Design a protein around this nucleic acid. Structure first.
Lengths: 144, 189, 67, 139, 61, 100, 81, 143, 72
RNA sequence: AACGAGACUCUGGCAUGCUAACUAGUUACGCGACCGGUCGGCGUAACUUCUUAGAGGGACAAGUGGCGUUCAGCCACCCGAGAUUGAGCAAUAACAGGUCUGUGAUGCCCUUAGAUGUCCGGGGCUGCACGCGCGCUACACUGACUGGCUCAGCGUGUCCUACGCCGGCAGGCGCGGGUAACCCGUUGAACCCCAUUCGUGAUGGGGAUCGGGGAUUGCAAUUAUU
């Protein structure tokens, strides 16, 4: 029959959803993507030149999985470890401007609608777009 | 049947020594899928002898302070080290491991008996369990010393350690340290 | 080591010398006859008396004891 | 109908619910194949590989997992499934196949039906942990 | 040559720090001969030892 | 209409006696009750150095206090409510009543 | 008017430690010898039905050097709950 | 798997030598004043692939790299990214480089030595500057 | 002493790669590196075009370890 | 005979048996979204497996086989959740052990109005040739970097904070919740795990040291608060 994104892999699905968004051109990319880091606990800028598409895909997948989040709640998700010199390492957080303008350059897609009692949720069209790509990923898994 | 990692069978493996035959657990009730069982072999004496020999190999490789709990990394180290030996020798990596365990254990040792100062050591026998434990220790020690600062990945230096021991070759840390150990014990006969 | 103490040994000897008729070889019945009669504190002390009672009744079948 | 049985490692607690089905095994509404740590994949596959695909053919098991860590949670699933299939039998089939499966499981692994009772010992002052003490200074 | 002997009973613990064990071992070939030996490590009855030098008999350590 | 009675104490024996008395009285009259639900125990911890001067072997006292909570729900008028509570009085028990 | 103070009598005075640790203080503050002040307290404690008693007095009783006098009578437990 | 025809082992960028076998995103980090985040944003704005070795660059590519490098303002590089942002004497946002980076540190210390600030006297005596505990650490150089 | 590895292929090393390597039974970046005295990145990059041409078969692939063999 | 030991108290592991739950859930059924499946989307009724916490059980060397002046006990095994869980308390008699700098505990001695009281301003307690102890980071490929995926428990809170907007960020503005199993919070923690780049070199390891900027706490940050 059909599938969802739970029936397939996720590290391959994010790689495939991030390519569906990069070929439409409706997603609007900020001017600072080539310069900024993604968090204050990172030493270098992201390796991939198209990190914005991959991060938009990952945020869309997280919104699909758990309904309702925010800029700080979506910044807790992409937090990690900061190595503080000769002092012990500590948990650290991402950048709210990225967490908010990936969550805003998804309303130009009509793909995320603001949650009623909170932040952002998924639209019926956004659910459609992820299921129709889970279908292709599952087809690639089955036929191979 | 139940074969290690789903592709390395056990029923073809034969233990040579009658001495270590009951101290190596590889064949019938020890045929497991992974070297991971959350076992409690360290609760009573002689219980570790029932631990599968591959899982015994896995533990001793998570040694030195930076690796003391990273067992999943050692499970793939052993998994990749078994798929390399089979490409070189063409034999069963379980058989290669068993032959390395048999070869690299000391059969005689020396024990301090003289009073502090001048060393008057004697010659004593070695338990089969200690012989197995020390073979494992030597094989795991030679794998990480030969890979400490090399381009060669680990699980390739472990494979080369295990190949050279199943042949009883002198190009092996465990064989070299077993020969030097029984040499001194003969001197103390 | 699992060695009883004079409190439990004395209490068990008294129970056996006073209630020989009802006591027997079964532990779980002697455990229930001790609670009915002797005013004993908690289960851990109750059981160590009722276990040495069961152990000490087998010796009686072998013959008399000096206690 | 259905049975609900739990498995329990250190603090993780998986609960498996079994009913009449067609062969669906799913944890957290997700396929058993793609539980996140693939290194320990065979531990989740051990019960079905030991028993056989034909015993999980009229049963539909759904698992919900919470608490603990990755490795503990994987161990809490293989025990939960095994216990739930043993509980589904001896209630809906007979007291003859429950014995067969229970024996087959318990010869291979006792932790497939009995829970490991070990838990962390509390820290004691004067040392970094339960047993380790601080380095003692002489002169 | 190399002999194989089977542990029949454990006598006690010897050594400066109790690191060795007295055993009496019975040979596989010419099983009528049993001798006293010292070992190192955990030993229980039924263990079979590989004796390289098979003429010595043990004494206290 | 809904009457919530909250009990909180430090001696679980006394608190449970009071709760059982209240439930039994409400059963004695013609009332419908929602049973005693036990909130998680509250454990307060103070750890102190034993010594007053920092000289010895660095021993510590581990102090703690435990607070026990219950909740009971009734559907009855306040006139009916204010008899059973006045009957049973126990030290250490903090009875509270809330009307919806 | 909210707070009211009432005064009542202790049921048994001999078994209250405070009432005996304050009774002995007003005998050492009034010129009694320590040895006879302490036996008069132990006797009244035991005659009231106590199972055991211990009284310790510490300080400079003889000169510029302090020392402790301990008077015990009966059973006395030290350990456990 | 590539065999480029023209390939220089040691190239010369900004009065300093750079290994041609090193990777371009980290090769120029060798010349003083450039780190591991400025050397990457210069290359993105110059539109030069980061996978190439430093040797695999045409003359125009290397000449362009210095041009964007030395004038970050004209190519939309934010002001908080430089190594001397609001200069004391002229107040201009500029990135100082190998021969200038050390020519604007000696001026910084000479300011505080001539104007007898506490920190300029610390730099003068050779003791420590950021308010440290000199009782135990730092016993190298001192006899 | 220092371990100087070639970063880029010359004629001799490329020919030895094309001919000598595909019969090792142990094609591997850590093996080809010491065989051809080339960097662990050049050999790693060169072992994917051998797979693309079909001249060798991939056995294992992972982060820490990748393992190749000969054809047939 | 007594104290000490043991017992005792708290804690961990077991109960599909009991008492309960809208400030915990599960199952079922509807409504809804999407391709019978997924939904921590929404609402009802079955109850207590999961969560919470009360009562009572349960383990006693009890069963078997050996050893032991066949006693006291020791070793192995079956069954079993478990065959030693970890702590609290803790004797007689002492030490010229520490504390007068914890106290409206306290004896003597000293001082008490240009004070040894008390308040205010600024400094020092951190200063640095050199020795002596607890530690934190490392010396790397069983790794670092960059992305992706995926899991806790003990605690705090009228300062803990959700949501939205501007910021690269540290950080700022407007509304909200919580005196708390009700809100932060279903506490999306880190190692772990999966792909990439690096390739034995004082190297992209490792971060000391120092120069420019920016922002916060405070009356005040200059002898760098963070």
């Amino acid at each position: 029959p059909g599938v969802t994104v739970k029936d397939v892999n996720q590290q391959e699905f994010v790689r495939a959803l991030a390519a569906f968004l990069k070929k439409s051109g409706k997603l609007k990319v900020p001017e600072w993507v080539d310069t900024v880091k993604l968090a204050k606990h990172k030493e270098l800028a992201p390796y991939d030149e198209n990190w914005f598409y991959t991060r938009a895909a990952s945020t869309a997948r997280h919104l699909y999985l758990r309904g309702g989040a925010g800029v700080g709640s979506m910044t807790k998700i992409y937090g990690g470890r900061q190595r503080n010199g000769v002092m012990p390492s500590h948990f650290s957080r991402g950048s709210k401007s990225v967490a908010r303008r990936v969550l805003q350059a998804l309303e130009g897609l009509k793909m995320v609608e603001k949650d009623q009692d909170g932040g952002r949720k998924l639209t019926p069209q956004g659910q459609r777009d992820l299921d129709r790509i889970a279908g292709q990923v599952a087809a690639a898994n089955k036929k191979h | 049947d139940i074969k290690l990692f789903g592709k390395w069978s056990t029923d073809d493996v034969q233990i040579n020594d009658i001495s270590l035959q009951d101290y190596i657990a590889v064949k019938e009730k020890y045929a497991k899928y992974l070297p991971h069982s959350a076992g409690r072999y360290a609760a009573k004496r002689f219980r570790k002898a029932q631990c599968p020999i591959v899982e015994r190999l896995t533990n001793s490789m998570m040694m030195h302070g930076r690796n003391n709990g990273k067992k999943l990394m050692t499970v793939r180290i052993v998994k990749h080290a078994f798929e390399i030996i089979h490409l070189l020798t063409g034999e069963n990596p379980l058989q290669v491991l068993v032959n390395a365990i048999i070869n690299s254990g000391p059969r005689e040792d020396s024990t301090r008996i003289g009073r502090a100062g001048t060393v008057r050591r004697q010659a004593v026998d070695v338990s089969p369990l200690r012989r197995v434990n020390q073979a494992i220790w030597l094989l795991c020690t030679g794998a990480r010393e030969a890979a400490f600062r090399n381009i060669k990945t680990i699980a390739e230096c472990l494979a080369d350690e295990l190949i050279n021991a199943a042949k009883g070759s002198s190009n092996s840390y465990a064989i070299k340290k077993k020969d030097e150990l029984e040499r001194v014990a003969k001197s103390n006969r | 080591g699992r060695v009883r103490t004079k409190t439990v040994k004395k209490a068990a000897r008294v129970i056996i010398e006073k209630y020989y008729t009802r006591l027997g070889n079964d532990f779980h019945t002697n455990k229930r006859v001790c609670e009915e009669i002797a005013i004993i504190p908690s289960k851990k002390l109750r059981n160590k008396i009722a276990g040495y009672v069961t152990h000490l009744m087998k010796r009686i079948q072998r013959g008399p004891v000096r206690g | 109908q259905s049975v609900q049985v739990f498995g329990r490692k250190k603090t993780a607690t998986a609960v498996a619910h079994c009913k009449r089905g067609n062969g669906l095994i799913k944890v957290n509404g997700r396929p058993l194949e793609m539980i996140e740590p693939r290194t320990l994949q065979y531990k989740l596959l051990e019960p079905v590989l030991l028993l056989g695909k034909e015993r999980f053919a009229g049963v539909d098991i759904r698992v919900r997992v919470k608490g603990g860590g990755h490795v503990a949670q994987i161990y809490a699933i293989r025990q939960s499934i095994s216990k739930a299939l043993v509980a589904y039998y001896q209630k809906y089939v007979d007291e003859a196949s429950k014995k067969e499966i229970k024996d087959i499981l318990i010869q291979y692994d006792r932790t497939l039906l009995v829970a490991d009772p070990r838990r962390c010992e509390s820290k004691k002052f004067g040392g970094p942990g339960a047993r380790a003490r601080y380095q003692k200074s002489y002169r | 040559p190399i002999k194989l002997a089977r542990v029949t009973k454990v006598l006690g613990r010897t050594g400066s720090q109790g690191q060795c064990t007295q055993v009496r071992v019975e040979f596989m070939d010419d099983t009528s001969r049993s001798i006293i030996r010292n070992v190192k490590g955990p030993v229980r009855e039924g263990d079979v030892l590989t004796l390289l030098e098979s003429e010595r008999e043990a004494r206290r350590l | 209409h809904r009457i919530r009675i909250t009990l909180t104490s430090r001696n679980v024996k006394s608190l449970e006696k009071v709760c059982a008395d209240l439930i039994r009285g409400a059963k004695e009259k013609n009332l419908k009750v929602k049973g005693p639900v036990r909130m998680p125990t509250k454990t307060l911890r103070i750890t102190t150095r034993k010594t007053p001067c920092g000289e010895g072997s660095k021993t510590w006292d581990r102090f703690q206090m435990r607070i026990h909570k219950r909740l009971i729900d009734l559907h009855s008028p306040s006139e009916i409510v204010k008899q059973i509570t006045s009957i049973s009085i126990e030290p250490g028990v903090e009875v509270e009543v809330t009307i919806a | 008017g909210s707070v009211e103070l009432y005064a009542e009598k202790v049921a048994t005075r001999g078994l209250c430690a405070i009432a005996q640790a304050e009774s002995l203080r007003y005998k050492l503050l009034g010129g009694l010898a320590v040895r006879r002040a302490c036996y008069g307290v132990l006797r009244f404690i035991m005659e009231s039905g106590a199972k055991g008693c211990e009284v310790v007095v510490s300080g400079k009783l003889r000169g510029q050097r302090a020392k402790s006098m301990k008077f015990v009578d009966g059973l006395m437990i030290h350990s456990g709950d | 798997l590539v065999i480029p025809e023209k390939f220089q082992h040691i190239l010369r960028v900004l009065n300093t030598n750079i290994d041609g076998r090193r990777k371009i995103a980290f090769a120029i980090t060798a010349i003083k004043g450039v780190g591991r985040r400025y050397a990457h944003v210069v290359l993105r704005k110059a539109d030069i692939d980061l996978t190439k070795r430093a040797g695999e660059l045409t003359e125009d590519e290397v000449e362009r790299v210095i041009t964007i490098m030395q004038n970050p303002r004209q190519y939309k590089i934010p002001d908080w990214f430089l190594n001397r942002q609001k200069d004391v004497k002229d107040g201009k946002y500029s990135q100082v480089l190998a021969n200038g980076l050390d020519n604007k540190l000696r001026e910084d210390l000479e300011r505080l030595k001539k104007i007898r600030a506490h920190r300029g006297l610390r730099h003068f005596w050779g003791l420590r500057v950021r308010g440290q505990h000199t009782k135990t650490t730092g016993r190298r150089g001192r006899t | 002493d220092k371990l100087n590895n070639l970063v880029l292929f010359d004629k001799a090393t490329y020919d030895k790669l094309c001919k000598e390597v595909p019969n090792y039974k142990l094609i591997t970046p850590a093996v080809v590196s010491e065989r051809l005295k080339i960097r662990g990145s050049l050999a790693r990059a060169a072992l994917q075009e051998l797979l693309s041409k079909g001249l060798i078969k991939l056995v294992s692939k992972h982060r820490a370890q990748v393992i190749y063999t000969r054809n047939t």
